Amino acid sequence: MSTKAIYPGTFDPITNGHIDIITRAASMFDRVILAIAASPSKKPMFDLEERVALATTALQHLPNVEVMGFSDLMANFARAQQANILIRGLRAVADFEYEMQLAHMNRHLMPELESVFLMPSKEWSFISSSLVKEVARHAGDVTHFLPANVHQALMEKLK
Amino acid sequence: MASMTGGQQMGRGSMSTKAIYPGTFDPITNGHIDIITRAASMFDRVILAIAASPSKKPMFDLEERVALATTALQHLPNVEVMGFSDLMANFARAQQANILIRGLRAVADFEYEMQLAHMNRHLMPELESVFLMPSKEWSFISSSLVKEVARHAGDVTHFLPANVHQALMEKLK
């Protein structure tokens, strides 16, 4: 019957690469929550409210997607939301190791939650939030990597 | 609204899913059974696609591979087992599949996996590759390793379903 997936992240801010991942996931699962980490250990450029607002606008056109902040154990959030799937984008070899480690822990914490991995499109295969910010901080053109609403929000933050 | 549109795959909610999980499965292990059990839990239908003519000559022929797997997975109602002798993207297309299951064991594989996924996007845009990590229990096993342990009389009963374990013992006298 139903599939409900969580796509967790800091999304600081959401990029076209994230948008690609969640568009693909929302085509394969009945519902998807974009789960935005409230309190990441490194303080974000955008607070949770901004991160959530930006992502909501960017994903508004996807009918079975909902954007939410969260501040607890992912196992507890997924359990609270009755999710049975966890989506991760998988850009780098470095990230794979870490994600396999969290997956195993998540299996221990919540056996009924299956973790699922998608590779990024070749177009978005080298972009991250961090990189786009760095480029944009020194006036590089990043219009290709962000939706308009996010782009304007980033420009404002750097002025 | 059929007389206006047949419908697109993207941006319109959830769609019927049919996945293929290709491999040589020579023979199918508990690791393989775990991957397909997981995928079968999240997708409507799953086809275990067994490669007819792998580059390295397999210990079990296609017929044996297909029979063992069919038995091992018969308790999963939405799974079927087929041989195939094509590109995995062509088989997917023939089979009207939209999902490609890949197990992701090792870091050494990841680059290769990404590259094959880019090739498959190029060959069949509508086919989505989906990656599952193996359970910690099966993380270090492979058909090849189980065969080589078994050849020299190591105990591999933990790693295989019973039908396969028996077939394997027969192959090794």
Spatial distance between the Cα atoms of B83 and B22, rounded to a whole number of angstroms = 9
Among the partner-chain residues B11, B15, B129, the one whose CB lies closest to the CB of A23 is B11
Cα B96 to Cα A29, B11, B18, B88, B127, distances in angstroms:
18, 20, 8, 12, 10
Spatial distance between the Cα atoms of A59 and B30, rounded to a whole number of angstroms = 39
Cα B59 to Cα A26, B35, B73, distances in angstroms:
41, 22, 20
Spatial distance between the Cα atoms of A8 and A18, rounded to a whole number of angstroms = 10
Spatial distance between the Cα atoms of A68 and A48, rounded to a whole number of angstroms = 9
The number of beta carbons lying within 10 Å of the beta carbon of residue A159 is 5
Domains of chain A and any CATH numbers: 4-157 (3.40.50.620)
Contact B130 A28 (CB under 8 A): yes
Torsion of CA B35, B37, B41, B42, to 10 degrees: 20
- For residue A114, the chain B residue with the least C-alpha distance is B38
Spatial distance between the Cα atoms of A89 and B38, rounded to a whole number of angstroms = 18
CB pairs under 8 A between A and B: 80
- For residue B125, the chain A residue with the least C-alpha distance is A121
Question: Closest by alpha carbon to B36, among B95, B100, B98, B93?
Answer: B100
A70 membership: H or E segment, kind and range: strand A65-70
Residue B49 has phi, psi (to 5 degrees) of -100, 115
Is A89 a known ligand-binding residue?
yes
Contact B133 A24 (CB under 8 A): no
B114 close contact with A: CB closer than 8 A:
yes
B43 close contact with A: CB closer than 8 A:
yes
Active site residue B135: no
Report CA B58 to chain centroid distance, whole Å.
Answer: 16
User: Chain B partners of A104 at a C-beta cutoff of 8 Å?
Assistant: 133, 136
Method of elucidation: X-ray
